[PDB]
Amino acid sequence: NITEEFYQSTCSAVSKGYLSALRTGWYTSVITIELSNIKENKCNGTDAKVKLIKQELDKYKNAVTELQLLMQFLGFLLGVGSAIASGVAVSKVLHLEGEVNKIKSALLSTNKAVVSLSNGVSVLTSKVLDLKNYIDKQLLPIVNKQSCSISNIETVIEFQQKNNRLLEITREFSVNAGVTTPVSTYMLTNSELLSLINDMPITNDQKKLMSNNVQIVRQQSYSIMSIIKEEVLAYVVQLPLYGVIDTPCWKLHTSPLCTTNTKEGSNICLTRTDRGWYCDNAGSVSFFPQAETCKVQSNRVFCDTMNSLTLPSEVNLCNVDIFNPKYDCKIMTSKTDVSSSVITSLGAIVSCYGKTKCTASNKNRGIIKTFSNGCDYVSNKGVDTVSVGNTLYYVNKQEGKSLYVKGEPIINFYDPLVFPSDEFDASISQVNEKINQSLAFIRKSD
């Protein structure tokens, strides 16, 4: 499964076992709730049974009215999308004349139908709740039969269950301005969402993937309010569809790499800034700089190409030889020699500088390693916690073998006299350019 390599030379680590599930595009469905506009109830009197049904009908009638009022490091390199552009684009089409009537007619006999909208796009539609028929054909008839003092108390409770979902939906949208993420259990129950996946135009491998991770799918989905014309409430559900699946993926962890002299100043530091998730797709490598935004379950990675850059395969060369000519690896430089630790998939990188106390501890044995100054690594095999200064990090206990690639720290090849100490997004070649400009200009004057 998962493995890990720590490169001592550039103070970074690569975890390799993972598999992709990249969100590549969107699927939009139209969800409808058929609900009825009720005429004024003539049930006077405060008989205890009566007050409950009148109160419940009133909660429903207000909820409809409430709904009517409501309808009226390198992250900076990424670029700016519009998360709900697709679903909103579908939502606006539903406003056109007799589009609801088409949807309404399509779901008249079943609860699922494919409708060709006026713009030509065919979308799945679902009737997930039928309060129109329940109220008009079961509840109100029982009220007239029993003259509003219901003999059988269970029918009012049967209504209260049906009505709660419409009340929770109207409560959520009252607070979200009609666009929510993740999509709630009231908007789409778990069984409904699983059912939409079976009917989506994707391979069984994709259907099986989504069905086994509905909670991830749910979190990557949007719920867009659309209309309440006629007797219908309609909102668009925007689902992620994963167009790239099961390609190899790897995560890069990076930490500052500094010289190890104890004197307070005069230390110089260097950090790889390309930390994040890498997944090769379609002959290229997709890079996700904010690895927090990617969600991992088992050994499969769900990222979103909205948060990616599309890079040449040669990026991989930065891990093995940072100075290679084929790709200019991104680095940052400073004189701030602060101690910290980065917990990786299968261990921990410890950048220990200055006078910091740095230790690795076992749950049973106590402290079992004290670090020297510099960037080092420890496997999660014998180690349970790592303590850097006053910070105690627990280590990941995911199983897998890690291997330490010894090497001379890269920072030793720079002398502090010509080293450019404020560069936030420089490269291997860019630092050399500033060194040669600085090494010639100072030398030439003498």
Binders of Zn ion among residues 64 to 83 (CB under 5 A) are 81
CA distance 176 to 271: 41
Task: Retrieve residue 212's tokens.
Answer: 């086994």
| Least gap, CB of 81 to Zn ion (angstroms) | 5
Nearer to its own copies, 259 or 308 (CB): 308
416: left (phi over 0), alpha (psi -120 to 50) or beta: alpha
Contact yes or no for 393/341 (Cβ under 8 A): yes
- Chosen residue from 1, 37, 85, 248 binding its own copies by CB under 8 A: 85
Residue 364 CA from chain centroid, whole number: 37
Q: Which residue's CB is nearer to its own copies, number 260 or number 385?
A: 385
Query: In the bound complex, what is the minimum distance in angstroms from residue 153's beta carbon to Zn ion?
Result: 26
Q: After which residues is the chain broken (C to N over 2.5 A)?
A: 72
Pairing verdict, β 401-405 and 3-7: parallel
User: What three-state secondary structure class fits 293?
Assistant: coil
Q: What residues numbered 2-21 form the site for its own copies, per CB under 8 A?
A: none
Distance between CA atoms of 14 and 159, rounded to whole angstroms?
Answer: 57
Nearer to its own copies by C-beta: 136 or 328? 328
Eight-state DSSP code of residue 75:
G
Tell the smallest beta-carbon distance from residue 392 to Zn ion (Å).
6
Residue 436 sits in the site that holds Zn ion (CB under 5 A):
no
Q: Which of 423, 311, 320, 347 is nearest to 10 (CA)?
A: 320
Q: What is the smallest separation between the CB atom of 424 and its own copies, expressed in angstroms?
A: 6
- The reply to whether 140 sits near its own copies by the rule CB under 8 A is no
User: How far apart, in Å, are the Cα atoms of 334 and each of 73, 83, 146, 263, 265?
Assistant: 15, 36, 82, 16, 11
Q: Which of 394, 436, 437, 442 binds Zn ion (CB under 5 A)?
A: 394
Binding pattern for the stretch 121-150 against Zn ion, x by CB under 5 A and - elsewhere: ---------x--------------------
Among 40, 364, 406, 443, binds its own copies (CB under 8 A): 364
Residues in 78-107 at the binding interface with Zn ion, rule: CB under 5 A: 81
String marking each residue 383-412 x if it binds its own copies according to CB under 8 A: -xx--xxxxxxxxxx---------------
Strands 276-281 and 284-288: antiparallel
Q: Which of these, 250, 235, 266, 265, lies nearest to 166 by C-alpha position?
A: 235
Which of its own copies, Zn ion, none does 70 bind, CB closer than 5 to 8 A by kind?
its own copies
**Per CB under 8 A, which of residues 144..163 are in contact with its own copies?**
152-158, 161
Report 60-79 residues binding its own copies (CB under 8 A): 62, 65-66, 69-70, 72-73, 76-79
Q: Is 413 in the site for its own copies (CB under 8 A)?
A: no
Q: Shortest CA distance to 10 belongs to which of 416, 417, 262, 332?
A: 332
Q: What minimum distance in Å lies between the beta carbon of 109 and its own copies? A: 21
- Nearest residue (CB) to its own copies, 206 versus 385: 385
Under rule CB under 8 A, how many of the chain's residues touch its own copies? 119
Task: Supply the angle between the helices 48-70 and 154-176 in degrees, to the nearest 10.
Answer: 20
Using CB under 8 A as the binding rule, whether residue 362 contacts its own copies is answered as: no
Selected from 338, 381, 382, 412, the binder of its own copies by CB under 8 A is 338
Does the protein bind Zn ion through residue 415 (CB under 5 A)? no
User: Residue 233 and residue 165: Cα distance in Å, rounded?
Assistant: 13
Minimal CB distance residue for Zn ion: 394
Indicate which single residue of 430, 432, 435, 439 sits in contact with its own copies (rule: CB under 8 A): 430
Q: Which is nearer to its own copies, 105 or 338 (CB)?
A: 338
For the bound state, the minimum distance from the C-beta of residue 311 to its own copies, rounded and expressed in Å, comes to: 8
DSSP state of 268: -
Indicate whether 424 belongs to the interface with Zn ion (CB under 5 A). Answer: no
Stretch that binds its own copies, among 30-38, 166-174, 200-208, 316-324 (CB under 8 A): 166-174
Whole-Å CA distances, 90 to 108, 120, 123, 128, 231: 21, 11, 9, 19, 20
The residue count of the chain comes to: 446
Binding site for Zn ion (CB under 5 A): 81, 130, 393-394, 413
